Design a protein around this ligand. Structure first.
Ligand code: 7DV
Ligand code: 7DV
Ligand code: FE
Ligand code: FE
Lengths: 321, 161, 332, 167
């Protein structure tokens, strides 16, 4: 039962101008309005804006933790070096019927074809990492590309933003101006006064400022590290493009403004709860649920992760703290 | 005109859990400002836990005792000005067991070591609390702060209250 | 009842300047320190000892620079310190059969910062102009005679410790002519080129290498194990050695020596008694272990490169004491 | 004229333990060049040990397979020229148990990750082998190297073979 590696570039469609692609038994085609998926025995359609926003995340996150559901049918499960792609795996209708379909891939093989899909299907003026009010539209025939938008380098602190050799603070000068929906956020540096010899370990930065300057939405990015404890804050606007079903607990601390989380059962997709978080609110997302957030105004969110690879197995024998 | 809403000890508006079919306890919902406002000064109350790792909420008020730790920690200032004073310990093993975890309170008295530096944090500023350093805080007015650490001797667990 | 009260002593004192010699004497607990034209003169309740002032200053320089180091630093067969890591025992005759059997050994335990402060004042006051107790005899002047100026610069050198590795961003730097570290005369033939390092964009902070033998050839002091790279408690502490290690080191753990250039001979004695046990000759590439039950003192004719390898875990000394850790790390 | 004597795989001169009243085995005395000369290419033989920590000696010759480690390691070249290739693993946990210690041989096959860089070491040069990276070596001519690491799946112990036992 070895992980698959078979992927293929199919033809360009003459009318639409887009290329279609194959990964194992799945095929991917887009037209003016839709991503059209097929697999052995079934088919599915996702509006292309939702699809591209979702694909942007799975790509940027390297398949992330646990389950990335594009929607109630299609998604991926990260096995960390391998990845399952599914239609209906976490949908009771498909599963009670025996109509779910899963294929396990080597992660770099699936990632390579996902990157090609994302590049080909993204048009000039359309940034699938941005909120709708910040960017153009993906509809219609192929028209140029936005490869710059979809190839942004991941930033990850090794220990903390701003430390020597570590991920830098964001400034106008290094290409990171304050986003319009955080135009009022204070931007002063903390006062840092190190004695001679201790410059490298006396360090502080304006985290709210750094987040106010994030050039993408819904992208947890590590700012500070204590062993497996990762503080991954991010700037959120509109809707989280996926329903995340994590294979471990994760916590959200709302830093500004407000987000509402739609919480559904991880396995079935059934609605379970709705969590409203305002500035200072912290809550846990248990491993047995999937969640999707809604943020009207661009807001600052701390996603707190435990990146230990031992946790998933341990949950497969609690699911809540 | 754009207004980014941040919380404060004196001004927060807690959200909550709306149930369709679940147990609200599963979400362990709290507000870190409310938790800090209800704690003793510099008491480090766990508000998030994930195995051994914690987020702790605290209210800085006046001058704290000295702390040190067997691993790095981080402090994020959430409301009000907080000073961090750092001292490089001559023998950190004399003060913290290098196989312990979580901060250890090491006293009000100045520990033995060299002046490392001073940091003044305002709302939204994060500082490194590096392993091998002793640290303490000063806040002229009550201020909220958050720690990224591991559960240990100073971690207060108040899950019921 | 004073909660500031400790078993470990804190009482030290600057005594009088001698008008004939120009030197100040000092007191630490029951011990007194006086120097004259030729000698360090030590007293404690019930006895006294003399050490030639050059040997004494070279040993004191090490004990100060190392912050009391690991375990026992014997200045000689009588006098020394034991590090307890925040506290320190100063002794006379503690590791000497003749004193121990007769019950004439004397030990006092101090808070480390208190003993260190007076040791620093002693070193500064007793070091004279043109004398560098950190240097080999051919590189420096003489300590003899009445007080004549000082060499506070030589005795105040900043300790150098890598947090992860020499040369990494924010870590201890490579040595250069430009930053005050020219190549030592007895290393004049050592190649100085840096390794080729090409990082791909975004990875410049973690693709890192440096010329260690070059770095050692520029060490401005002798017999000073200095951390160059760290893996947990494993510390690579290389140094440049010339003449005689100014102390007999009785470690409270096993430690290892890898000879990187030229040759050293180690005089190995029993840690407890000081009885000769072995003489270890190490040439380039030779690696050996110093057992935790011995003390050692090195001899290096030509300035040589030595890697001292330590395990800095604080659990070790109690384990050795209990016999839960072995006195030799490996048997075969 | 000053001559700093350095060892090499084909030119070293071992010293040893002279006994007054002791056992030369207590000194666990070897020569890292001799050890590297007699081992298989890239075999990592323990020459020092202190609880879990090790110094390993190895001969670099040809191209090695890939290694990775759950902690930092350092390599010091002792003789010859050694090229080091570093690769940032996409998923290091797929190759190295996070609870493991010591280097892991992760195969000759190219692991999945991004190229980090290349280092060329000569005698006396040290490189960081950072946690999270895979590394491999190329030496055109035979070369000696030392690792600062922790005992694990790749460390070969043979104290009886390499150490002085008499005299
Ligand atoms: C996947 C994910 C992204 C995000 O930006 C916040 C929460 C999440 O679960
Ligand atoms: C103390 C000490 C210093 C040194 O330079 C070499 C070995 C040692 O044991
Ligand atoms: Fe999530
Ligand atoms: Fe020693």
């Amino acid at each position: 039962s070895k992980a698959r590696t078979d992927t293929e570039h199919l033809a360009i469609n003459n009318e639409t101008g887009y290329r279609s692609f194959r990964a194992g038994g799945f095929t991917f085609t887009r037209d003016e309005y839709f991503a059209r998926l097929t697999w052995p025995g079934g088919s599915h359609i996702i509006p292309i804006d939702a699809f591209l926003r979702a694909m942007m995340r799975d790509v940027a996150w390297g398949f992330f933790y646990g389950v990335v559901n594009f929607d109630h049918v299609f998604g991926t499960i990260n096995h960390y070096g391998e990845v399952t792609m599914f239609a209906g795996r976490f949908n009771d209708a498909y599963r009670n019927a025996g109509r779910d379909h899963e294929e396990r891939f080597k992660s770099s093989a699936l990632m390579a074809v996902f990157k090609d899909i994302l590049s080909d299907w993204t048009v000039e003026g359309y940034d699938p990492f941005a909120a709708p009010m910040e960017t153009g539209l993906p509809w219609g025939i192929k028209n140029g590309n936005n490869d710059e938008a979809i190839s942004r380098q991941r930033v990850t602190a090794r220990r903390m933003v701003g430390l020597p050799g570590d991920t830098p603070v964001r400034t106008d000068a290094n290409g990171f101006p304050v986003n319009r929906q955080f135009a009022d956020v204070p931007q002063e540096q903390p006062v840092v006064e190190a004695e001679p010899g201790f410059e490298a370990e006396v360090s502080a930065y304006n985290l709210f400022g750094y987040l106010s300057r994030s050039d993408v939405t819904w992208n947890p990015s590590v700012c500070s590290v204590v062993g497996d404890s990762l503080f991954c804050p991010t700037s959120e606007e509109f809707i989280l493009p996926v329903e995340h079903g994590n294979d471990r607990c994760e916590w959200f601390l709302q830093l500004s403004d407000e987000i509402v989380w739609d919480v559904k059962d991880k396995e079935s997709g059934k609605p379970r709860a709705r969590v409203t978080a305002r500035a200072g609110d912290i809550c846990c997302m248990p491993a047995d649920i999937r969640h999707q957030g809604y943020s009207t105004k661009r807001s600052m969110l701390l996603v707190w992760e435990n990146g230990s690879p031992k946790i998933p197995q341990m949950i497969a024998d609690p699911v809540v703290p | 005109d754009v207004v980014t809403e941040f919380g404060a000890l004196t001004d927060y508006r807690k959200g909550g859990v709306e149930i369709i079919d679940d147990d609200p306890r599963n979400y362990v919902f709290s507000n870190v400002f409310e938790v800090a406002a209800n704690a003793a000064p510099y008491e480090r109350v766990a508000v998030g836990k994930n195995f051994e790792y914690v987020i702790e909420s605290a209210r800085a008020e006046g001058t704290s005792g000295w702390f040190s730790c067997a691993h790095d920690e981080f402090v994020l200032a959430m409301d009000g000005q907080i000073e961090v004073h750092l001292l490089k310990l001559d023998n950190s093993d004399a003060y913290v067991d290098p196989d312990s975890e979580g901060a250890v309170a090491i006293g009000e008295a100045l520990p033995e070591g060299r002046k490392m530096g001073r940091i003044v944090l305002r709302r939204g500023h994060m500082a490194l609390l590096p392993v091998g350093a002793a640290y303490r805080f000063y806040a002229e007015q009550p201020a909220a702060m958050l720690f990224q650490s591991i559960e240990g001797a100073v971690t207060v667990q108040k899950w019921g209250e």
